[PDB]
């Protein structure tokens, strides 16, 4: 609920380059500046003779908002012989996937084709580049001697990638073994130490890889998507991967052990061709330190009040439990054909309430297919089924839909304000947007009405002026505030009180405030973080019995407190926001004595 949508950071790339198809954060391992990594897989490069080789850009944060390409590889196609290229980098879609662990940056070209040494072929084995510091090495685990559809010739390695917490690379290629798909995991230490540019198929030791299986599993697309998380409690991150065509298009999600690639758990979709497994994510959403699985099925069709199927998408949320089971719940989209669930981005603890949160993208929702991103906050029971915020894209295109939200990445506090921030990509408009998280003010309010029971015959107060003999009672509203992170010490609240609120317009109001002789009383206040309960009292009174013949319904004292947000800003320009989960209104009710 606390993301700043009024003035987000906006980055642009070359038109038609799909700038924003992939997004990530960059955290150089020197506590240095932070950057944004943005993939532009159709961008033209200076590589000799290469058309739309693609590139990955590093973007400054708020220093200039400038992006510059990262030089992973400045060369063209190697030659097996004169006029006989060894590889084909044009339209290789370099940057279709980008992942960054501390210094390391991993970017891949899932449509890189390579000839072979035996015969003139064009096989999309895919390739990746890993840059640590000055060191940059090529990582093409599927560029083996296992040539063809039957082998890994069409593996498209790098289609999806991730880093484990122990500096292992998780990579997926959906084309291996007649599109059964494949997962491969290699130690970054191996990837760099064993690199030899003279060797096209590098023998990495300690490599983990799924194996070819029976033909019944063909065309399953294992490795279409990947995520990492521990699911046997041994501290070793395990491999989650979507398999969207498995189970005769019901879709599946495989989990393999991150130590030996042994199969651990399986998920299966519920509807044909829902693309169950298009996206997967792993993050502990309920604070039990057990990673929870999120699975997207952006084509899942719901049933409507009229009984009509409507394609809205669906996300499954599977809470891991110590017993090894999973506690699953579904989450349906809101707009037809919006493809809710195409992207699922762990956000860390966005509102810093103690539970991790998550963003789910409907890249083709909103007005004119401008895309929508939903924010879901976590809690002890699981994920809050109602989104606490809705992010909309402001940009429209004319060739391919903006796809705002097609890619996302959160869980990084780029402005060091104490709250994680979110990157949203929109490759259809060659745009990438950074949303910064505003600090959250938890507010403790209180309202006391004494005496509670009121006797009209009782009269121990006097009205303003010479008027006398009115029944009265006291009201004492209180307010207290605190917060986490970069916040000012002083806060200017606006409180309002209303007596006999429940009576609708055109109905007599029995209670009035003493001074104002009106049922409403406004008030500006000022409180500091962690400060004491700042209170204030005033007196209210009842009208004469002759003016109202309703002595049955109770009299509610309503209190509403609002905060002028602009005054409590920060050097960032980032205003705080009131905790949306604590209601900003409280009410106590008094009663009329009867005899």
């Amino acid at each position: 609920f606390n993301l700043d949508v009024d003035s987000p950071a906006e980055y642009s790339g070359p038109e038609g380059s799909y700038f924003g198809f992939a997004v990530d954060f960059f955290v150089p391992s020197a506590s240095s500046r932070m950057f944004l990594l943005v993939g532009a897989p159709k961008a033209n490069t200076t590589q000799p003779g290469i058309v739309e080789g693609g590139q990955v850009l590093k973007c400054d944060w708020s220093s200039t908002r400038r992006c510059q390409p990262i030089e992973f590889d400045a060369t063209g196609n190697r030659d097996y012989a004169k006029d006989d290229p060894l590889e084909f980098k044009s339209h290789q879609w370099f940057g279709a996937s980008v992942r960054s662990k501390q210094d390391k940056i991993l970017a891949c070209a899932p449509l890189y084709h390579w000839r072979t040494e035996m015969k003139q072929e064009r096989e999309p084995v895919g390739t990746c580049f890993l840059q640590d510091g000055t060191k940059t090495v090529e990582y093409a685990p599927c560029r083996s001697q296992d040539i063809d559809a039957d082998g890994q010739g069409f593996c498209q390695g790098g289609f999806s990638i991730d880093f484990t917490k122990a500096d292992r690379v998780l990579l997926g290629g959906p084309g291996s073994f007649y599109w059964q798909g494949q997962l491969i995991s290699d130690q970054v230490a191996e990837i760099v130490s064993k690199y030899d540019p003279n060797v096209y198929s590098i023998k990495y030791n300690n490599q983990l890889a799924t194996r070819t299986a029976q033909a019944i599993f063909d065309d399953s697309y294992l490795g279409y998507s990947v995520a990492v998380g521990d699911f046997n409690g041994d501290g070793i991150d395990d491999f989650v991967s979507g398999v969207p065509r498995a189970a005769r298009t019901l879709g599946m999600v495989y989990i393999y052990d991150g130590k030996n690639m042994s199969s651990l758990y399986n998920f299966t979709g519920e509807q044909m061709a829902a693309y169950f497994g298009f996206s997967v994510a792993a993050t502990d959403i309920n604070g039990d330190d057990y990673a929870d699985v999120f699975i997207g099925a952006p084509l899942f069709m719901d049933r409507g009040s009229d009984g009509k199927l409507q394609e809205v998408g669906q996300v499954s949320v599977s809470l891991q439990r110590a017993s090894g089971d999973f506690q699953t719940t579904k989450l349906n989209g809101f707009e037809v054909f919006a493809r809710f669930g195409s992207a699922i981005a762990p956000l860390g603890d966005l509102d810093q309430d103690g539970f991790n949160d998550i963003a789910i993208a409907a890249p083709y929702g909103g007005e004119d297919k401008k895309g929508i991103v939903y924010i879901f906050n976590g809690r002890s029971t699981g994920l809050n089924a109602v989104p606490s915020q809705i992010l909309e894209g402001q940009w429209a295109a004319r060739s391919c839909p903006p796809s705002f939200g097609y890619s996302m990445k959160g869980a990084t506090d780029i402005d060091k304000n104490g709250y994680p921030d979110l990157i949203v990509g929109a490759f259809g408009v060659d745009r990438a947007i950074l949303y910064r998280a505003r600090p959250v003010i938890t507010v403790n309010a209180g309202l006391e009405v004494y005496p509670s029971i009121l006797n009209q015959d009782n009269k121990t107060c006097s009205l303003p002026g010479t008027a006398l003999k009115v029944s009265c009672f006291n009201v004492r509203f209180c307010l207290k505030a605190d917060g986490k992170g970069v916040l000012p010490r002083k806060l200017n609240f606006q409180v309002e009180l209303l007596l006999d609120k429940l009576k609708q317009k055109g109905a007599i109001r029995r209670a009035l405030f003493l001074y104002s002789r009106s049922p409403s009383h406004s008030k500006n206040m000022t409180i500091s973080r962690g400060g004491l309960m700042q209170c204030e009292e005033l007196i209210a009174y009842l009208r004469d019995e002759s003016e109202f013949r309703d002595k049955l319904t109770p009299i509610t004292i309503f209190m509403e407190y609002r905060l002028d947000y602009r005054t409590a800003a920060d050097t960032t320009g980032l205003q705080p926001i009131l905790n949306q989960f604590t209601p900003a209104n409280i009410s106590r009710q008094a009663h009329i004595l009867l005899d």
Epitope: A81, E117, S144, Q145, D146, D150, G151, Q152, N198, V199, Y200, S201, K203, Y204, N205, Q207, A209, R211, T212
Partner: antibody, heavy 118, light 108 residues
Framework: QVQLQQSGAELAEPGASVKMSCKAS????????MHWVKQRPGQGLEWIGY????????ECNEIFRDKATMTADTSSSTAYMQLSGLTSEDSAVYYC???????????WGQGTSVTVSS | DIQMTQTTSSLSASLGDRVIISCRAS??????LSWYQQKPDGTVKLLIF???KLHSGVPSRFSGSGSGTDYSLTISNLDQEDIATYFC?????????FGGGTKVEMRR
């Protein structure tokens, strides 16, 4: 840390057959071809053929087309070669060598000696 | 088939000497020539591939050169563990063929 461990010495009578193994470790066995080489006592090296372990496809030197048959067990990362219709000319040391690429063989087993006598 | 011939079947050298082994092919093999070391116990190691590329782990002393049909291995600063037989092998076309082998013996 790539290692190719070959089986022990084989003895066989004329006309019989032998089957030798070559277990690989230190790399992904399925992703690289396995070559086989013959070396007669005091002689040079003779290339028999190669096998694609994951697919079973093989290519042989025309000499050994009817002599040798190559197989592979992926689950155990083991390559096998069987020599049939044995003679005295088949008595030799037989190496297995992983395929580096670039028309070279980067890692070699210790060799399996085969002796054919009555 | 490509015929690989190592003219000198044996040569003698002393410690520290520079040893150059020759190898000729019957056809242009487009630099796809490798060099192997075989020690008296049967152990075989790859030294050079693609005519000049050191395999991982072999010392810098070994180096390769050549093109077309003529190729040569070079051992600078010969070590005691270098006494062995050295084979060349073309990899440009099947079947892979080896040279007769050159044997390096210590001088005395």
């Amino acid at each position: 840390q790539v290692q190719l461990q070959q089986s022990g010495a084989e003895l066989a009578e004329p006309g019989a057959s032998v089957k030798m193994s070559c277990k690989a470790s230190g790399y992904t066995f399925s992703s690289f071809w396995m070559h086989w080489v013959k070396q007669r006592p005091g002689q040079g090296l003779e290339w028999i053929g190669y096998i694609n372990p994951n697919s079973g496809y093989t290519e042989c030197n025309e000499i050994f087309r009817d002599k040798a048959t190559m197989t592979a067990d992926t689950s155990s990362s083991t390559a096998y070669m069987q020599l049939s219709g044995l003679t005295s000319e088949d008595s030799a040391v037989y190496y297995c060598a992983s395929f580096l690429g670039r028309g070279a063989m980067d890692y070699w087993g210790q060799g399996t000696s085969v002796t054919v006598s009555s | 088939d490509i015929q690989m011939t190592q003219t000198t079947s044996s040569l003698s050298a002393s410690l520290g000497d520079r040893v150059i082994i020759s190898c000729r092919a019957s056809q242009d093999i487009s630099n796809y020539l490798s060099w192997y070391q075989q020690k008296p116990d049967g152990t075989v190691k790859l030294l050079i591939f693609y005519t000049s590329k050191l395999h991982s782990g072999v010392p810098s002393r070994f180096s390769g050169s050549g093109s077309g049909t003529d190729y040569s291995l070079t051992i600078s600063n010969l070590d005691q563990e270098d006494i062995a037989t050295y084979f060349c092998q073309q990899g440009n076309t099947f079947p892979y063929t080896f040279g007769g082998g050159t044997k390096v013996e210590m001088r005395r």
